[PDB]
Design a protein around this ligand. Structure first.
Ligand SMILES: Cc1ccc(NC(=O)c2ccc(CN3CCN(C)CC3)cc2)cc1Nc1nccc(-c2cccnc2)n1
Length: 263
């Protein structure tokens, strides 16, 4: 995975510095546009290296693709493919809804649940599954990613919980209550991500304050079916949001339900 900082031209920051220390670059060797995550320097060197190691272990059509890293000498790089249409959240808000119709929404959900079915089998845990962490390429190709948005991001999307920031409105109750993350809380976050897709990137639990979200989920409040969302997709959302993690379907299951539907 190692490669020459001589094979890479660092150009502008991607998405106007929304992704933090991540740069648009060219992989000279192949006249290729890449994304390069850099490191400041900060005492974040530990988690940056776990990250590269993890990425080495995973490969799937629907996971953002590692291409190389630069971790002998600073500056420390990690290098992936570059996705033309950018993050999914903005893509949905900005799209031609006649192009990105019902069938496309469904295709988008399918691909993500295939990426997740994969991490599941490899016993990985994403931990921050959301449209903002997905990328779109040509022909509505969607890849799941993880950009480390907790400390970058600008607003009430992430809120503080003991030196950590959690996106409350994506977070499974057991994770809010007991700090318990598992593939099942990924399943919960996928149900919220389903709702983002169906509302074309609306914010979840609109206007509901953060501090009442847990209490509402406990009293069994769930977000309504969006306008135009197939009932079986919504029933699936409803299963991802089962109170008990073990009552939640698996991404194997979800992917199968989504693969059938794709008709
Ligand atoms: C340049 C880079 C460096 C690292 C990563 N890392 C990941 O995307 C990633 C994905 C999955 C995991 C798996 N991991 C398992 C353990 N749990 C806890 C967390 C997730 C980890 C990192 C992506 C990128 N890609 C990236 N980053 C930011 C922006 C963009 C981008 C933006 C616009 C157009 N094209 C690309 N592309």
């Amino acid at each position: 995975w190692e490669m020459e900082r001589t094979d890479i031209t660092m150009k502008h920051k991607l998405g106007g510095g929304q992704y933090g220390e991540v740069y648009e670059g060219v992989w000279k060797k192949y006249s290729l546009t890449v994304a390069v995550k850099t490191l400041k320097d900060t005492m974040e060197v530990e988690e940056f290296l776990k990250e590269a190691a993890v990425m080495k272990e995973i490969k799937h059509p629907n996971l953002v693709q590692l291409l190389g890293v630069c971790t002998r000498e600073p500056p420390f790089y990690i290098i992936t493919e570059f996705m033309t249409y950018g993050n999914l959240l903005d893509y949905l808000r900005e799209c031609n809804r006649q192009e990105v119709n019902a069938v496309v929404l469904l295709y988008m959900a399918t691909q993500i649940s295939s990426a997740m079915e994969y991490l599941e089998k490899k016993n990985f845990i994403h931990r921050d599954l959301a449209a903002r962490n997905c990328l779109v390429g040509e022909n509505h190709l969607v890849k799941v990613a993880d950009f480390g948005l907790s400390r970058l991001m600008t607003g009430d999307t992430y809120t503080a919980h003991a030196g950590a920031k959690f996106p409350i409105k994506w977070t499974a109750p057991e994770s809010l209550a007991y700090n318990k993350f598992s593939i099942k809380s990924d399943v919960w976050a996928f149900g919220v991500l389903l709702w983002e897709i169906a509302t074309y990137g609306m914010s979840p639990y609109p206007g509901i304050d953060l501090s009442q979200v847990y209490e509402l989920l406990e009293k069994d409040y769930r977000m309504e079916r969006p306008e135009g969302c197939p009932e079986k997709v919504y029933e699936l959302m409803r299963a991802c949001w089962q109170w008990n993690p073990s009552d939640r379907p698996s991404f194997a299951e979800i992917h199968q339900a989504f693969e059938t539907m794709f008709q």
